[PDB]
UniProtKB/Swiss-Prot annotation, chain A:
Entry similarity comment: Belongs to the universal ribosomal protein uS3 family.
Record-level Gene Ontology MF annotations: mRNA binding; rRNA binding; structural constituent of ribosome
Chain ranges of the KH type-2 domain: 37-105
GO biological process entries: translation
Name of protein: Small ribosomal subunit protein uS3
Record's keyword terms, sorted: Ribonucleoprotein, Ribosomal protein, RNA-binding, rRNA-binding
Residues of the full protein shown: 2 to 208 of 275
UniProtKB/Swiss-Prot annotation, chain B:
Gene (UniProt): rpsB
Protein name as catalogued: Small ribosomal subunit protein uS2
Organism per entry: Mycolicibacterium smegmatis (strain ATCC 700084 / mc(2)155) (Mycobacterium smegmatis)
Cellular compartments per GO CC: cytosolic small ribosomal subunit
Molecular function GO labels: structural constituent of ribosome
Family per record: Belongs to the universal ribosomal protein uS2 family.
Record keywords, A-Z: Ribonucleoprotein, Ribosomal protein
Gene Ontology BP annotations: translation
Amino acid sequence: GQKINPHGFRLGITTEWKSRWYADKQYKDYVKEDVAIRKLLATGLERAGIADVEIERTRDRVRVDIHTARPGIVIGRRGTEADRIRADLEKLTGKQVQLNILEVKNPESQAQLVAQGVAEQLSNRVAFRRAMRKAIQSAMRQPNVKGIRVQCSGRLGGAEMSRSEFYREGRVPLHTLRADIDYGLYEAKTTFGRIGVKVWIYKGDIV
Amino acid sequence: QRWLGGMLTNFSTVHKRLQRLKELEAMEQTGGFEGRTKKEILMLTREKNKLERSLGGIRDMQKVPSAVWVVDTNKEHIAVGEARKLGIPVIAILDTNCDPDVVDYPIPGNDDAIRSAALLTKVIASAVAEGLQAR
RNA sequence: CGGCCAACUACGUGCCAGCAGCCGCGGUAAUACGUAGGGUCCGAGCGUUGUCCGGAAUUACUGGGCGUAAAGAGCUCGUAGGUGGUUUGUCGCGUUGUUCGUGAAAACUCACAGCUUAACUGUGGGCGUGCGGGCGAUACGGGCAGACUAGAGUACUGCAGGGGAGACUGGAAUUCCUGGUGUAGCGGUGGAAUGCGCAGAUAUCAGGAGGAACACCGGUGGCGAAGGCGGGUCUCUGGGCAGUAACUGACGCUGAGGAGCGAAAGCGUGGGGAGCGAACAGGAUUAGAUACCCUGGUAGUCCACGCCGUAAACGGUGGGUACUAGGUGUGGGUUUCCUUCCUUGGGAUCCGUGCCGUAGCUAACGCAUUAAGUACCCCGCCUGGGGAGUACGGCCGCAAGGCUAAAACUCAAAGGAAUUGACGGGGGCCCGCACAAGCGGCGGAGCAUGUGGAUUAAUUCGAUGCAACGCGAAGAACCUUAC
RNA sequence: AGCUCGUGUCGUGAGAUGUUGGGUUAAGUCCCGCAACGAGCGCAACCCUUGUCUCAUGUUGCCAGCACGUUAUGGUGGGGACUCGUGAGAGACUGCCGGGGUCAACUCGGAGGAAGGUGGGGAUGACGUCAAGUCAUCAUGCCCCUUAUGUCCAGGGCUUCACACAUGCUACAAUGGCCGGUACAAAGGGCUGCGAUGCCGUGAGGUGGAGCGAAUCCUUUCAAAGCCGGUCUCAGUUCGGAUCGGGGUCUGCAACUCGACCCCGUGAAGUCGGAGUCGCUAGUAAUCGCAGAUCAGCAACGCUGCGGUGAAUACGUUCCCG
């Protein structure tokens, strides 16, 4: 175990909590319903890139905000997708649950989306070098990106021997607290097993 | 001061040094000596001094030197070798211990004397000055 | 149908059954096994085996090598042979041109023709690389008859030297013997013990006997073909170098076989024997010491005369010759100029012996005017690694043994140089409760807990140096719980 | 404190150089040189806590100056003064001085200061190594089971014991045991939980329920070592508590296997521990108590924290280890 999770390193300094509420007696069941919501949204939607899911609660009403790179896919033009998600979130005993669907401004500057794309390419047929090079170039093309590192490991290329490979470009100062490191991990489903892709993206520092 | 090994061959890399020197001159002009830590600004000033001291006549290198004038080729063998690799003609004053096979336009004479080398530099400077006159 | 080398998937099997020219594939997901689809290459054929050539420059005439990869005889002398400076005339042997005869046919090759084409057949040339006869040329090689002095040798004048053989001889030291003084230890080691001494040792002094080796000079300095050679003197003797160039006039080089010399050890006969010292004895160390260390100690080491004939006999580099930048030490000798001419004054030159460095060469390391560069002449040797420098036969030897020198079988390598790591009972410089300085513990007792082992129907499973063992277990009566 | 990359250069090539040399540092930290010039991950800093001060701040927290108090005290009206709690900020930067230093890094000493030279302690663990561990948190390729290797239940087992190893606790006593009196903490927890006063037991505890989602109430107002007094007099003892007999309490459906605790009795080994070996450099070791998580209860002497009292020693890198 080498490196701690970058989000947890800067949780109180740079990054922010993804769940915002206060509970004293009802902390445990709040946590249970939050994880249920998260797993439901993870399983239901896979096509549009789900970069982040926030949950806010206040007594009866529950506010869940999600960021996706393809908002049109997850939303029903007549509300059909909205109807389905609303109903099955009511079924999660959430009382009144309301949704704010959002869109990320720069999908290529978001680590989770980058890892999702790399893993999706890896799954079907693509050689891993191609995927890493393409992701690195696309991210560095963005204005705020100051450094990106992509690393994936496993039975790469269907080999019998597991391997770890990584390429870096620019600056990725993992030990610096003020530097904001966007971290994204997502597992690629291949016929020979499971391939894990980790992405670190560095875009300046916040003081 | 000192020939950085590979000015001519590694031109693209060493041009970045001139770019950085200009950036740091701009930073001096804007006055950013207090916005960061004292150690960082001190190290930055030291870097400024080192870069300007090691690169005195290098701030005008646009493309490449069309010719090289050198004193005591034995001492600066790296510069002559770089010119020979690039094919740039080299004009040198060769002393009795030098190799005439490496220079194209030798000028036999002493280089250990300040006065003789000074006189030769006068001659070459007059040549280049009049040539810049007749552009 | 993995790559060489055109052409891939599925099922079955699992270190089996099997495949395979080599590398190598079979360990429940094989493009290498077996079978089916698909494909590729050929096609009345397609594969396998056997044999020859090619690839193989891997016997190298074309067309290879020998410092370290296999390969320079240990070194010389010299026989047969090979090879040979400048120049004149001649011969026409080699060499070369031309011509005539011959080189059967068939075959091969070129053209044409006939089978319906082709294979096949025929016709006409070429080829038949050669040999014999005539005629022409004389540059080169050779022969013959001369000439020359640059190679080679002689003469004369100097020079340096541990070159060799013999005889005689000197001093220091070790040992022993004798006689004084003189006491209780000496000797030896990492530490000791065997050992010597108390019957007078070790120490010190005087005297005597004997053998061997020659401190300083004394070095990367000299001599010798190599092995090798330094105490002094005398006798006999070999080679080298320089100068003059008086003499001879190619008399040169190499050298198969052959002959001679050839460290140390060893062998024979006869002497000698101080020190050292295989073997052999004890002591010690060690788990064991047929060793390293200690105390003794025989052959041998020494001399005379003979054998042996090997060495990391190495510069791991055969001999001769010519040419190809320099710089700087040092040994021997001749000479011009600074000139005191005292002075490595300096230069030039010939002969040695080192270091550094170009060009060039080499796989690299390196070599580099003392070549491992550029060339010519002659000799020795190499042809993957083991088996094996061995067996058999032979020759030599008193013997030990030496020289010459295989095969069966077996492997798919064995090798050279250099690079990056790792390591060292290699070196240097540093660090850390690493040691040292301290304080408190564990290992002993009782109990708690975990583990091994054993036991049981079951004692669920996982964790085994640091980095498993009050760990997963932050809570096993039922539940947990998987037994 | 190291691991690399781009370009350049050297080499037929594997590769080399940078990253080596001198100095310096905790550090590939920095400086000077240098066929190298730069860059990246590491180092350091940015974060938390702690040590000083300033401003803001007064409740459930303080109470110095004023009043009411009845012993029972900030208890009560009142008050920012002093603590404290929590927001913002200042403050250590070789900043200054003197000396070594290449006038460079760096280093020694001094002043000021609460603090002096990365102040103390945390969090943060580069490329990789060890096919290290984990298919029993989870997920997962392939293989296997599928009237069972799934699944329900009762009972049992995971606690078995001739031994061996490992981590701990309690001791072997007078620097102590027992009895009486008495003084000082921090941190943390609490709703179907903490649970006080009172009453009943000798004691676990029983009854009862005040007040508390808590700077308020409860954990007692909080400790133990400590201090004072008395006794014991060097003994297998007034040390030591194992083992065993009898009697109870509580939790729980249920304490046989197999819970903790309380009372009476019992009173084992043990006299400071061989070879060997472990931790620790200062608020540290040693020692004393308190709290939390897991949890109906507990095998907790374990683990994670908190405070009390508080040492000795370092000449120096030859040896052992990395």
